Amino acid sequence: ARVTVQDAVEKIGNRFDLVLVAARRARQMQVGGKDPLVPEENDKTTVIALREIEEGLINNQILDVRERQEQQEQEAAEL
Amino acid sequence: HARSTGSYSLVTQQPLGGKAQFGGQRFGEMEVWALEAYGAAYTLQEMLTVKSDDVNGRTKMYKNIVDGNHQMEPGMPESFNVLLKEIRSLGINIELEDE
Amino acid sequence: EEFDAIKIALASPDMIRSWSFGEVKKPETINYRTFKPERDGLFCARIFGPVKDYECLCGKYKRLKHRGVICEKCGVEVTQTKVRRERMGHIELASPTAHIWFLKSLPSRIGLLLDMPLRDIERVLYFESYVVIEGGMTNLERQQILTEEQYLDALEEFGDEFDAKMGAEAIQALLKSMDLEQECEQLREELNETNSETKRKKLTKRIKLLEAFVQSGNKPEWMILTVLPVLPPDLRPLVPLDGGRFATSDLNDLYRRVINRNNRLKRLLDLAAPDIIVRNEKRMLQEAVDALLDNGRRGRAITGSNKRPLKSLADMIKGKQGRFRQNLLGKRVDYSGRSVITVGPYLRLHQCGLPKKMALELFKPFIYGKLELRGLATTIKAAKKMVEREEAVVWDILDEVIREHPVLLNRAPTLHRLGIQAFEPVLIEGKAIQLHPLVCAAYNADFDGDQMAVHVPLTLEAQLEARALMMSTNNILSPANGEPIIVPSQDVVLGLYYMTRDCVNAKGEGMVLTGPKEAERLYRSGLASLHARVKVRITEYEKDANGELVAKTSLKDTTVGRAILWMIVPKGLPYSIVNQALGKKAISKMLNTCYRILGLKPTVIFADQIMYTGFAYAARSGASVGIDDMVIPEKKHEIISEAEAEVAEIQEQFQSGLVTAGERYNKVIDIWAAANDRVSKAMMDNLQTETVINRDGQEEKQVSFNSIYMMADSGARGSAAQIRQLAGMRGLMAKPDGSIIETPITANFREGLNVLQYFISTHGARKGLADTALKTANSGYLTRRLVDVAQDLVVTEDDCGTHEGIMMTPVIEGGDVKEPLRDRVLGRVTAEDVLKPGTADILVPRNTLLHEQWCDLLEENSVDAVKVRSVVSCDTDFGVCAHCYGRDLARGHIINKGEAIGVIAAQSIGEPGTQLTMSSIQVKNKGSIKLSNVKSVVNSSGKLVITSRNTELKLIDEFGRTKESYKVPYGAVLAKGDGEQVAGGETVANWDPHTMPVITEVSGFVRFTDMIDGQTITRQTDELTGLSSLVVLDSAERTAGGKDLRPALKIVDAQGNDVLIPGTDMPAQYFLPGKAIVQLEDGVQISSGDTLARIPQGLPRVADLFEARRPKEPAILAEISGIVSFGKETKGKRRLVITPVDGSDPYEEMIPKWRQLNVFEGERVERGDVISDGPEAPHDILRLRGVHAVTRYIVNEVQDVYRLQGVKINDKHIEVIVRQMLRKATIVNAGSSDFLEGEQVEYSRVKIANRELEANGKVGATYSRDLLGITKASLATESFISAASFQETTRVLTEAAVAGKRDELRGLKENVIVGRLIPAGTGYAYHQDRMRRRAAG
DNA sequence: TCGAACTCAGACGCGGCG
DNA sequence: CGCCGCGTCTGTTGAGCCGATG
RNA sequence: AUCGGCUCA
């Protein structure tokens, strides 16, 4: 997705919802401190989010499920 | 010519203009139509508040940029409330309802 | 802090005191010697605030310990100094004054309320007369103005039973005295009586205003002021100069004048000075105030020192310099720069260049962050100095930061949305912004001194938007019409055209190769020529299978150049793409075909490779132009000599008087034009194919290699006309008036030209130059009005669920093909099922997106009219749906909800405006003659003549689609029969281009009854022949004795009864109109097909259609069908007794008969049929025909003006603008709202779908429909910020202030003002989530 | 408060008078 | 109803430079 | 800050 962002569009559906999803993922990598999935190859967080979306790993419901799991398990392990 | 941060006006709090006094370029309404046709909506929110008029916004934006976090806290372009006071000085009760 | 809506009212004196912080009394500003604010002056620190943070004035308390402690000895609160911007003040006037806006604006809003005329109110307020408030004596009445003289007589005659006084106090008394209930109810009850238009309109306006005051909550007496407010200091600073001078806004001056007048009038009022002093002082106070409000309105503007008017308050909001346009819709911006552009061809089309130091100044804080993170600099100052000294680690970091970080390039003016794009930097050294070649056609940029601006996106969302929406490789189809926008321009095409061509002799003739690679080796080693015909072996791939490739090989017969090209075509294209000499049309087809088959990414790679190889193989040939190339034809002396001989002979014949004046002129220009044409043809027969070269034998001729001819043939630059300028005669030239001068230019640009030939070229040259510089004004103005009307509309809902729309048919009419069906149906969605001439073949579930395959299938059959779903009919309120609109032209699929549609349409319709201001009916092709709804009759000779305007001649092919269409007048002669195959080149219709016949389709006697000459007619016997008929005089010459009697022949039988129209009992006797002079006299019949009587005979167009402007020749239409009649005659103009078959007649007014009519006194018509002739007013069409009539009228006319000059825009962009004109309706019946007030139509359709549901049977109202120009439908809208933002700010703001409206924040401008997220595009989802939360609590 | 201003022009709506 | 005359209100977008005045 | 004048695409 360095040059053309054609595949991810079909992979989600809009030129717009792609922007919000990719921005949210790149935020999670920017400050939240999570680790990426696809290898870096010396590339910024934004293109990394786009590659993850294109390959088929970070959808929307996947984000929701994953954050729900981490929240519940850390809260339960707090005690 | 090129600018990243400099002077600011007095009555309306947005950057000066022309190379002689180290000002920023102009983003006339034609460019605003161009940027609405595309569908980009965050970009001109950025160009309307935190690079021009929103004071708290611009200081905190510079803080975040130099700090490594790329985000944005917007407010209200304060030349708008300049307009509010110019209208309600005529004897017209312009004033904006609350939530 | 957050809010939802904004609200206007009127401000009452308690409110004014509630805002303020302390009265202002004396007009001193500051001591000019000690720079301190005077106490109780226009800058006092007691009233407004401190001057420095947390310090008082005298200087006792300081800086945090005394927070809020109002110091006692100087009296200034100890808080920040960002309070000079917020606190207000007030002056208490000695006597009331009158607000201008509510007096001198159009209809005055005071004179309308009291109802007395304006002049009276001025003459009272100018201190000229008195007025009576209330007289207990009933002989006088309220409001009757009284001059001082009769005021005396009144004073002594009664004296005390009356109240009379002068000035603003009187108007307060009257404005207090009256109620708002009883007048409302009286006018309401007594309105219903007599529906005179004046009375109806006036009473509606009066009722509306009174009801507005009652309902809103205001009170009228607040219109005239008694406490002024004062705006804070920092909103009107006083800036120092170099040398003790002070520059201040005019507001301080305007305030000083009022302060002084107020103080002095108070003084004179305390001591009870004699009356005239008080009168003059009060009038001068009035003038000072209402010059402060807005300067040049009441009298003449009060100028400053420099003979220039002052700057009021009301002109710090208007104009091109006010707030709304200069400072609130377009900001200044930082993080930006600008410079001069220049080319670089080593790039790839998602890149651009940046000079080192521009990029080192824009990306500064990112650099600070990276340095501090790496640990090279501990603090910020270390980073400042390390960056300024420019140590190499800074260059390494800077190269790190800009990677993967797009910037935005812009060029002003930005006419359309391709004006700013998002590129990806590459650092270079120098001072100019390099830029790709292929993307200069979109910007409209040339490299001769243009300039370009650079912005950066800061945040993390905006960066993804600059990558996924507006990058350079994502938009390669223009949204006006899906034609690609990266055509290879002017130099690459000449390389592609010089590679792929063939010479007849070169070398390596006829030897065989094994692939493209050995062709490259041979051309490069110098054993073969770049173009010398050969046969090679190639391997080409087709993917005709189920989506996967298959390979086939063969020996093809081609040159060496084409076999070099075949190395870059990308494995999906047939080889016949390359076997030709590649003018730029072939290159554009090449790219388009790649896009169709293989998708996007191969198209980008392939386009870039074409650019590279074109450049490389165009420099390698060397292609210069020299004075030997302009080749003069040899046969040029003879042609001009012959033409001059001919003109000399015509001049001789004239001087002998044989021929007239104008005939000589016309014949001379014709002969000169013919000489021009054959000189040009001789030239081009010498250039194109004259290289004669020999190989393996005798001689052959091939197309040439003349540098001018290659630059003009392939399509790089130039054309045939301009080569003609350079070699042949350069034509005839026109003088400024517009005429054509007689003796033409004769020399060209190679032979050089004379003196006065040059002095004549200058005329046309300056006319062109002067026009090019004075279009742009009103072009830009028109674009602005369109964008401002179509602003709001966005695509909201998915499927509107409406039923049928409009119908599409070809418009090849007049001549041959103008628009097929294909280009008027690609993209739409079918409004129903279209049957097929092979029936039981239904094609839709009532609606399918008609993409290419379906238009092709529909082409293979023979249908010629479809019905499509148009955005003028969609029902969804506040937007449209996603099917009515259809295909998204740029993307290539169905449109996805959330786009902005108004702005795209307005930009793409107002952008080409820069190029813009610059007998017999013959069958032409064989085919059947078809006439439908036609009345005709076989003539006396045996052929056809028409008695119905309704049908016109349709020439139909063997399949059914109409080949051609012609309009033919009434009763003309035809040379064929209906429903037969007719040969082409045939005069199928004939008539004298002046003569209109009055034929009798019926058969019988014609005898003179009802006409007695000198009364309706006169006897004018043709002295040349002897036979004539009683001449129907024109209305002017026909006398008043028979003026009221229609000149009427009686088409009779042998018995005497009126001849009935065949098949019906309607008598048919010709009540002949004027100029219908019959030829055949009494006792003489007129049978079928015999002539009784012969009746001889730029940019503002576009900017005037879209304005709903009215022309001045209204072609009256037929209001109701059926027979017609006439009535009383020529009282200025005649009357028109319409004659409904079973309805009522008396509808009639004057008639323009001064032009030739159509209908006779006794004819049966259908509604909407012309009467007189001329253009039309669109309001009439909308009244009498529906909404589809007006849409089709507008679209075809505007499309005509555009299409005359080879500019094609799609058709949707005309329809949406019209759909933003018809959104206001007026009510005729009633039931919940008023009688005839204008009303947003969406609300009427919301009501009717509510109350006339099960709740009530029939009380929901009936509504007509209304049409408005764009400059007037923009102003009369719901929201008062979307209408006060561009034009008429004071009028709109005042009529909103009186009635107490409230804005609602729904459009797109309304949100770019206050700084929120647009409700369109990315900012959509969240923006409707806000609305969902507005509803659950 | 005397001192100019001039031939922009095209369109629209209102106040008088028939 | 129908002339006929009167005072408001509009007229491209970014930049570069130097006198004048307060 | 306003005004006048020249110039660029």
Ligand SMILES: [Mg+2]
């Ligand atoms: Mg240019």
Ligand SMILES: [Zn+2]
């Ligand atoms: Zn103090």
Ligand SMILES: [Zn+2]
């Ligand atoms: Zn619809």
